[PDB]
Design an enzyme around this catalytic site. Structure first.
Site, PDB file in Angstrom:
ATOM      1  N   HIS A  75       0.815  -1.226  -0.008  1.00 12.94           N
ATOM      2  CA  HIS A  75      -0.057  -0.053  -0.147  1.00 12.94           C
ATOM      3  C   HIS A  75       1.103   1.229  -0.057  1.00 12.94           C
ATOM      4  CE1 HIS A  75      -2.765   3.144   1.984  1.00 12.94           C
ATOM      5  NE2 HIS A  75      -3.289   2.741   0.669  1.00 12.94           N
ATOM      6  N   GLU A 130       1.105  -8.599  -0.859  1.00  9.18           N
ATOM      7  CA  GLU A 130       0.931  -7.416  -0.080  1.00  9.18           C
ATOM      8  C   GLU A 130       1.971  -6.685   0.211  1.00  9.18           C
ATOM      9  OE1 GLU A 130      -1.644  -5.393  -0.544  1.00  9.18           O
ATOM     10  OE2 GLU A 130      -1.249  -3.586   0.786  1.00  9.18           O
ATOM     11  N   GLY A 133      -1.911   3.667  10.264  1.00  6.94           N
ATOM     12  CA  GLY A 133      -0.595   4.093  10.746  1.00  6.94           C
ATOM     13  C   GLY A 133       0.605   3.266  11.227  1.00  6.94           C
ATOM     14  N   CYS A 182       0.957   0.161   9.080  1.00  7.98           N
ATOM     15  CA  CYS A 182       1.420  -0.577   8.072  1.00  7.98           C
ATOM     16  C   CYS A 182       2.969  -0.921   7.872  1.00  7.98           C
ATOM     17  CB  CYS A 182       0.701  -0.262   6.846  1.00  7.98           C
ATOM     18  SG  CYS A 182      -1.021  -0.576   6.859  1.00  7.98           S
TER      19      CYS A 182
END
Length: 182
Positions: free
Chosen positions: A41, A72, A146, A148
């Site tokens: 992300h 991911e 916040g 990740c």
């Protein structure tokens, strides 16, 4: 100082970096040499802010499994003088569950942050805000925005990278040693 506290603090000092991309603030794990891993992300561009300076990215790889499904994780090779202390020996060969794990976050907003997430179990498939993802693991802890990139660790093992939560539970992309093979 005890062994688990020493291990987590050394990981923070030598391997876990505060970063910023155009998508905001993330935690980055440096694994060996000039190779680091990010949550997908974060969408790193040609440069990434690492701690106190802008670093050129020489190569980025968004990992998928043998079916073509998102994992991911984005591997990045950095153009830097830093060489990361090699932590591949602490990454399991297969995605491994763990007891009483700690999630270690390190961003400008959440520096050197330790979160007691508890047991980490095999989960597998996860729909991450509309993107299907494989090889995830789960902790019954209400993680927040916040975090990740946060590093999941248990008894000297580095087992996952935090990728999101549902307000009651948190999820990581599992790490395996072969992702970082040369």
């Amino acid at each position: 100082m005890g062994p688990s506290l020493d291990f987590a603090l050394s990981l923070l000092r030598r391997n876990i970096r505060q970063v910023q991309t155009d998508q905001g603030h993330f935690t980055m794990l440096g694994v060996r040499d000039r190779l680091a891993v990010l949550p997908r992300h974060s969408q790193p561009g040609k440069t990434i802010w690492v701690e106190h300076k802008l670093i050129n990215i020489l190569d980025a790889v968004e990992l998928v499994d043998e079916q073509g499904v998102n994992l991911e994780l984005t591997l990045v090779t950095l153009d830097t003088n830093e060489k990361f202390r090699d932590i591949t020996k602490f990454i399991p060969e297969n995605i491994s569950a763990a007891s009483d794990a700690t999630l270690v976050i390190n961003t400008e907003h959440m520096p050197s942050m330790f979160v007691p997430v508890g047991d980490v179990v095999q989960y597998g498939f996860l729909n991450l805000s509309g993107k299907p993802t494989h090889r995830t693991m789960m902790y019954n802890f209400p993680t927040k925005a916040g975090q990740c990139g946060g590093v999941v660790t248990s008894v000297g093992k580095v087992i996952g990278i935090h990728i999101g939560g549902n307000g009651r539970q948190g999820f990581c992309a599992g790490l395996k040693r072969s992702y970082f093979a040369s």
